[PDB]
Amino acid sequence: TSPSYSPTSPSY
Amino acid sequence: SFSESALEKKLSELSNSQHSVQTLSLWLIHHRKHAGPIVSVWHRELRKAKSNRKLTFLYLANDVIQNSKRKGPEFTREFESVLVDAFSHVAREADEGCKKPLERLLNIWQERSVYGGEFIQQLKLSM
């Protein structure tokens, strides 16, 4: 199972 | 190739993983031309999903709202007329559960200022 999504992962 | 009924499928298949959210969110921005229909069916499938996946839908929102901005203000624009409902909806049905992850998503939203101050409010008080 892959790592869980993190809302911050998008590039800011 | 965009098709509403395919989106409903991908949505049905959306898992919580960092990969699932991030490449479904890429598919949607490929079709930024279809932003209005995309959001309207997200809003419908969101409200149909069980409570353990409602959060995950809001995390799809996040990754498309945030990454669509290098491409144009389509999904940003489409989602605001919806998010006050989606949040307030997911606030409830979190009846016997935790609204800390929703209150953080609002905070990483006013922090990065993905939306604007008066709209981060109303998003906060929708719950």
Author numbering:
A (entry chain C): 141 to 152
B (entry chain A): 1 to 127
What do the study authors state?
To test if proteins containing a CID motif that were previously characterized as pSer2 binders can also bind to pThr4, we started with a structural and biophysical analysis of RPRD1B, a human transcription regulator that contains a CID that strongly interacts with pSer2. We first used fluorescence anisotropy (FA) to measure the interaction of RPRD1B with a 16-nucleotide oligomer CTD polypeptide phosphorylated at a single position either at Ser2 or at Thr4 located in the middle of the heptad. Purified RPRD1B can bind to both pSer2 and pThr4 CTD peptides, with a little tighter association to the pThr4 peptide [dissociation constant (Kd) of 22.8 ± 11 μM for pSer2 and 5.3 ± 2 μM for pThr4]. To investigate the recognition mode of human CID proteins to a pThr4 CTD, we cocrystallized RPRD1B with a 15-nucleotide oligomer, singly phosphorylated Thr4 CTD peptide. We determined the complex structure at 2.5 Å (statistics for data collection and refinement in table S6). The RPRD1B-CID is composed of eight α helices arranged in a right-handed superhelical array, characteristic of the conserved CID fold. Notably, in both structures, the recognition of the phospho-CTD residue depends on Arg106. Arg106 forms salt bridge interactions with the phosphate group when the phosphate group is extended either from Ser2 or Thr4. The only difference in the CTD peptide recognition of RPRD1B for pSer2 or pThr4 CTD peptide is R114, which can potentially form a salt bridge with the phosphate group of the Thr4 phosphate but is located too far (6.9 Å) from the Ser2 phosphate. Our structure of RPRD1B in complex with pThr4 CTD peptides indicates that Arg106 mediates pSer2/pThr4 recognition through salt bridge formation to the phosphorylated CTD residue.
To effectively manage the substantial workload, Pol II features a unique C-terminal domain (CTD) in its largest subunit RPB1. This domain is characterized by a conserved repetitive sequence of seven residues YSPTSPS (repeated 26 times for Saccharomyces cerevisiae and 52 for Homo sapiens) and is crucial for coordinating mRNA production and processing. Central to the CTD’s functionality is its capacity for phosphorylation. Notably, this overlap was particularly pronounced among proteins harboring a CTD binding motif known as the CTD-interacting domain (CID).
